[PDB]
């Protein structure tokens, strides 16, 4: 039983944001209570909206009437609506239902209220060093800097096939010029490294993807 949320959305102050949450086919969005939690940076989540229908709903304590919800039964999707976006609305948002007494969360959507120019990430990939290889180890290093919004998703490839394990990715961190930075590590054995002709780091920023590639030879 799965709840699918987009990785990130951005919008300007005063605009409207629409945050979707798609429920897998074992669940029927029509008859599920929907819970939305806001998590501002450095803070515990907070109940933001309870939504069942336009006649059965409740805002969290402190949550202004700029907020509402909806459901589309055809796509099995629920929505969180925020109009007149204020910089104070910038946070991570989680949908959640109850399913035969299991508490299931979506993966979170990071909503950025634009307050600064956008910038695409600068991506550098380093191969394992010869010293590390000679110790039978191989860490690939993908470095991602100078981006806004502070939200990226990182995938890895080996010879054109998705990598499935050995990846660890940091959360973005605000850097000195108020842009954001992140890093990703692919941890392999030397013999793993030498088994493929190429490895690639893929960095996705608001639906656009950049891919750098290195070869063990």
């Amino acid at each position: 039983s799965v709840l699918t949320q987009p990785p990130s959305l951005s919008a300007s102050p005063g605009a409207s944001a629409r945050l979707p949450c798609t429920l897998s086919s074992d669940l029927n969005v029509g008859t599920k209570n929907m819970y939305w939690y806001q998590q501002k940076p450095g803070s515990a989540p907070r109940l933001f909206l309870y939504y069942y229908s336009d006649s059965d709903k409740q805002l969290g304590p402190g949550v202004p009437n700029r907020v509402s919800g909806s459901k589309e039964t055809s796509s099995n999707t629920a929505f969180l609506l925020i109009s007149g976006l204020q910089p104070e609305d910038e946070a991570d948002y989680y949908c959640q239902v109850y399913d035969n007494s299991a508490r299931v969360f979506g993966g979170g959507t990071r909503l950025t209220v634009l307050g600064q120019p956008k910038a695409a990430p600068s991506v550098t990939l380093f191969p394992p060093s010869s010293e590390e290889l000679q110790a039978n180890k191989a860490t690939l290093v993908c470095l991602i800097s100078d981006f806004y919004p502070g939200a990226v998703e990182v995938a890895w490839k080996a010879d054109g096939s998705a990598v499935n394990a050995g990846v660890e990715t940091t959360k973005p961190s605000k850097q000195s010029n108020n842009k954001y930075a992140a890093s990703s590590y692919l941890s392999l054995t030397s013999d793993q490294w030498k088994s493929h002709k190429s490895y690639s780091c893929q960095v996705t920023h608001e639906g656009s993807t950049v891919e750098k590639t290195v070869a063990p030879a």
Partner: protein, 217 residues
Amino acid sequence: VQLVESGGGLVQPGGSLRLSCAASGFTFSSDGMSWVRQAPGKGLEWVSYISSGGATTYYADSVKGRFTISRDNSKNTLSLQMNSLRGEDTAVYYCAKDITAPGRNGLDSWGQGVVVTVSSASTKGPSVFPLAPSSRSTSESTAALGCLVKDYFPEPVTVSWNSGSLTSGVHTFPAVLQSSGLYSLSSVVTVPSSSLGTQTYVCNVNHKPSNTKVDKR
């Protein structure tokens, strides 16, 4: 409403912690309660639920058999016994009201959480490897070189370049924490390509917790 957690900290794999949460500002004994966890840089996942009177408890599959949730309604405390801890369990743990009203539920209030870290290390110095320039990356004269600072514990590490003489174009990234319980970190510098034959690059890695320093050419 106040929910104040305590009793976290560092534990070795295969050990035990007992978390505690003291509640005020509402009739605690009338309400169900849950624990929810958040691993560093990841989303929310529900851990366990206990009903107002303690008769009913539920557990997520990743935790069932290992943890025990408890209540003392006279003392207004919630408890979580955590046995056989593994690396997956490193997270912030939130205590939350998990209510039953007519026609709804929901995690209405959340404490600010306690850190639980599961590391098999206690004090480990890093292995420092060069990130050699390795490509023109032309941009007229620009080349990127670095140091990988692998598998150290605990935080922090600081990095200098050429004993503090090189500061422009230095990008030291935030550390990642891997499922093994150890941190890794990278620092890169942007340098004129023309100078790679004239200028020596040395990164100065300081790890005060293990009383180790490294100067890596």
